[PDB]
Amino acid sequence: LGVIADDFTGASDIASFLVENGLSTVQMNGVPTQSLNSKVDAIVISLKSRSNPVNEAIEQSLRAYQWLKENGCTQFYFKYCSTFDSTAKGNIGPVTDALLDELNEDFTVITPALPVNGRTIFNGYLFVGDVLLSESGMKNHPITPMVDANLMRLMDAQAKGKTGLVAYADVIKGASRVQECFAELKAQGYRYAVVDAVDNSQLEVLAEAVADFKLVTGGSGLGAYMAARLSGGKKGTNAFTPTKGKTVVLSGSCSVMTNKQVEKYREKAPHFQLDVEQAIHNENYIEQLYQWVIANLDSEFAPMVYATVPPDALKAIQHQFGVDQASHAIENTFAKLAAKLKQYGVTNFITAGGETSSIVVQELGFTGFHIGKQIAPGVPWLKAVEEDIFLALKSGNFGKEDFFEYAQGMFL
């Protein structure tokens, strides 16, 4: 199974869904230049093609497909947002068409639905919670505003073909009936088919119906049920975790949740607060931190180096050292420390904060990861494809208070 996602958050989202439903998954960030020496059930390629120039999105998508194809994928999934984010030139249609063309196929399904998570489709109209898409916040979206809730109309505006519908009344009759409707829509000259779902069992039916489709499109909802069918109901209970090795926590976020997670963890393990003044003027700071970390790698809980300070104290630093000057010092420090620790032999990295996580992954040079056991919603355990290194990247809002120790508790 090859998934081609139009954004990072969505790629991570569906990838977790595939794993939480029994499928071994590898999420590549961008089209890879080297083959995947690993045998997995699903490979998700994360792109930045939600609203970039349409010919770029098409070329990139075709490149992702060619790679996924070269690397064993036989079924493809074009993943987009559950709110159908696009415009009349919105790449959803162009990309679907390009993919259909390349594949020598002429029909596929459309479904940004996951009823349990407030994304329902009735009569082809998309609802976002209790209201129509056109009535939600999406109506005034900053990049891709949505003023029409009718999916067949939205797709028709940006597609080369015509969009049909498999209504609720027919989905509730089963997979076979859906296929009969698929056969009917195709005879009527439809190239795509929106499928209703006001309840999750409708995705379960569709999942079964599209079992032999060379290509399918949608949000995470369908992909999840496709994984559940392919796995036979298996869950993520047996997804991997880090094996025993040296671990380090690098916290840089100053969000309300992170500040509490740090305040709760410094109580449990060795902690060294990263001082911004020293990050910019002391040249031996990285060497000091490195020595300190490795000399505290034997405690019960991994040592933690953190920049995390209350949003109040942070704004005070931003207005004394400068927003960008202080941001760099912190990022360059974690990056150079993480590189030294990896060379030394640390195999598990637990980061906190969006920027801190990106910089550490950037420095270590990882291009993709094997998705593992879920530590918290949105925070799975990872393992680089390049080498046996595990990482837990926690954006500032995810995880409960005891996140740091918990992340470690599961593999001990």
**Sole residue written with tokens 């040296």:** 246
Sign of CA dihedral 209, 215, 221, 224: positive
- Burial call 379-403: b when 16+ CB within 10 Å, e when fewer: bbbbbbbeeebbbbbbbbebbeeeb
CATH of the domain at 1: 3.40.50.10840
Bridge partner residues of 4 (DSSP): 45, 78
Tell me the C-alpha distance between 122 and 216, whole Å.
19
Domain that includes residue 345, residue range: 235-412
Q: Are residues 198 and 255 in the same domain?
A: no
- Report whether 24 contacts 41 (CB < 8 A): yes
**Sole residue written with tokens 């497909």:** 65
Q: Are residues 71 and 208 in the same domain?
A: yes
The answer to whether 120 is annotated as binding is: no
The answer to whether 353 is annotated as binding is: yes
Distances (CA, A) of 404 to 85, 339, 379: 35, 21, 11
Q: Residue 299 burial (CB < 10 Å; 0-12/13-18/19+)?
A: exposed
Q: Residue 249 burial (CB < 10 Å; 0-12/13-18/19+)?
A: buried
The answer to whether 396 is annotated as binding is: yes
Q: Are residues 183 and 255 in the same domain?
A: no
- Burial call 182-192: b when 16+ CB within 10 Å, e when fewer: beebeeeebbb
Tell me the C-alpha distance between 4 and 198, whole Å.
25
- SS3 state at 98: helix
Phi then psi dihedrals of residue 383, to 5 deg: -150, 125
CATH of the domain at 361: 3.40.980.20
Q: In terms of DSSP bridges, do strands 271-273 and 163-166 run parallel, antiparallel, or are they unpaired?
A: unpaired
Tell me the C-alpha distance between 86 and 133, whole Å.
13
Distances (CA, A) of 155 to 65, 89, 183: 22, 10, 20
Distances (CA, A) of 183 to 140, 188, 192, 209: 37, 9, 12, 12
Q: Residue 244 burial (CB < 10 Å; 0-12/13-18/19+)?
A: exposed
Q: Which long-range contacts (CB under 8 A, 24 or more apart) does 59-65 make?
A: 60/31, 61/4, 61/95, 61/98, 61/99, 62/98, 62/99, 62/102, 63/31, 64/2, 64/4, 64/31, 65/2, 65/4, 65/99, 65/102
Q: Are residues 262 and 344 in the same domain?
A: yes
- SS3 state at 205: helix
First-to-final CA distance of the chain: 32
- Report whether 267 contacts 321 (CB < 8 A): no
Q: Are residues 240 and 203 in the same domain?
A: no
Structure tokens at 304: 């933690």
Domain boundary among 191, 217, 234: 234
Q: Are residues 205 and 279 in the same domain?
A: no
The answer to whether 354 is annotated as binding is: yes
Q: Are residues 228 and 246 in the same domain?
A: no
**Rg of the chain taking only CA atoms, in angstroms:** 23
Residues with Cβ < 8 Å from 335, sequence gap 6 or more? 359, 360, 362, 363
- Report whether 158 contacts 88 (CB < 8 A): yes
Tell me the C-alpha distance between 251 and 217, whole Å.
37
Q: Are residues 114 and 242 in the same domain?
A: no
Q: Are residues 288 and 229 in the same domain?
A: no
- SS3 state at 383: strand
Residues with Cβ < 8 Å from 199, sequence gap 6 or more? 115
How many domains, the chain? 2
How is residue 113 annotated by DSSP?
Answer: -
CA contacts within 13 A on the Cβ side of 236: 22
Distances (CA, A) of 88 to 12, 53, 56, 267: 26, 13, 16, 54
Tell me the C-alpha distance between 215 and 110, whole Å.
10
Q: In terms of DSSP bridges, do strands 192-195 and 108-110 run parallel, antiparallel, or are they unpaired?
A: parallel
Tell me the C-alpha distance between 149 and 134, whole Å.
5
Q: Which long-range contacts (CB under 8 A, 24 or more apart) does 230-233 make?
A: 230/1, 230/22, 230/23, 230/41, 231/21, 231/22, 231/23, 231/41, 232/22, 233/22
Distances (CA, A) of 68 to 12, 384, 393: 17, 18, 25
Strands (E) in 231-347, as ranges, are: 247-251, 271-273, 304-306
Q: Are residues 2 and 109 in the same domain?
A: yes
Q: Are residues 214 and 249 in the same domain?
A: no
| Residue of 332, 395, 327 lying closest to 362 (CA atoms) | 332
Domain boundary among 183, 215, 234: 234
The answer to whether 253 is annotated as binding is: yes
Q: Are residues 228 and 242 in the same domain?
A: no
Tell me the C-alpha distance between 126 and 162, whole Å.
18
Domain boundary among 175, 200, 234: 234
